[PDB]
Amino acid sequence: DMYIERAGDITWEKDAEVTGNSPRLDVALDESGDFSLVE
Amino acid sequence: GETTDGVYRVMTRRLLGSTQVGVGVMQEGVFHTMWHVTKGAALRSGEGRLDPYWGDVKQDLVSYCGPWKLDAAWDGLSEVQLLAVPPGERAKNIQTLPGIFKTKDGDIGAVALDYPAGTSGSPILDKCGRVIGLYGNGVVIKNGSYVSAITQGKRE
Numbered sequence: 001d002m003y004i005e006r007a008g009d010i011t012w013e014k015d016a017e018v019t020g021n022s023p024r025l026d027v028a029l030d031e032s033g034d035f036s037l038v039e
Numbered sequence: 040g041e042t043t044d045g046v047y048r049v050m051t052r053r054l055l056g057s058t059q060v061g062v063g064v065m066q067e068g069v070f071h072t073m074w075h076v077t078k079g080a081a082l083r084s085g086e087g088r089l090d091p092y093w094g095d096v097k098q099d100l101v102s103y104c105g106p107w108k109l110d111a112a113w114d115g116l117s118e119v120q121l122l123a124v125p126p127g128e129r130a131k132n133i134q135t136l137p138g139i140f141k142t143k144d145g146d147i148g149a150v151a152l153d154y155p156a157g158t159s160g161s162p163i164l165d166k167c168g169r170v171i172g173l174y175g176n177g178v179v180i181k182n183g184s185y186v187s188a189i190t191q192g193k194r195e
């Protein structure tokens with residue numbers, strides 16, 4: 001049996017670690033909610 | 040049990056020790072998470088029980104105690120903050136500019152940040168603190184990395 005535990009508040013943090021790119025990917029979504037890379 | 044608004048870890052004792060299978064958002068007495076985290080199963084909150092209300096395998100979303108409450112959306116221009124709650128590690132806001140998933144049914148936001156599968160259900164936030172979607176459903180790019188979509192449900 002699964003259970004939940006509090007992890008914190010939902011607030012925006014000013015001066016947080018800015019990382020990661022912004023790619024434009026061509027994807028397909030199947031009936032099972034799974035994404036796939038279209039080419 | 041605890042219905043206080045905030046971000047929560049989804050855990051299980053069915054394996055060795057205590058294993059984090061995902062994350063979720065408590066908002067307006069409703070627990071929101073990704074379907075692949077719980078598989079529609081009931082959750083426990085102390086002595087209390089959370090029974091599922093709504094769910095969909097294609098959207099990969101599931102709500103507990105009531106209907107989906109989150110309705111904010113990425114504006115297509117601003118940087119967002121993934122409130123990453125990783126397994127065993129402390130909650131941590133990571134700022135990023137999202138990419139785009141182009142599909143036959145329209146474009147969706149996408150955060151290009153790699154995290155373990157146990158991070159699934161971690162909220163993605165706007166500068167207002169609103170939950171614009173959940174992290175955990177995306178694709179594996181050429182460099183093995185994960186680029187998850189910004190998965191938001193529908194508020195009736």
Ligand SMILES: O=C(Nc1ccc2c(c1)CNC2)c1cncc2[nH]ncc12
Binds near residue numbers: 155158
């Ligand atoms: O495996 C992951 N996600 C997932 C799993 C099962 C299903 C779906 C998504 C939607 N349909 C069912 C995953 C989530 N987070 C981070 C990751 N890194 N590598 C994989 C991941």
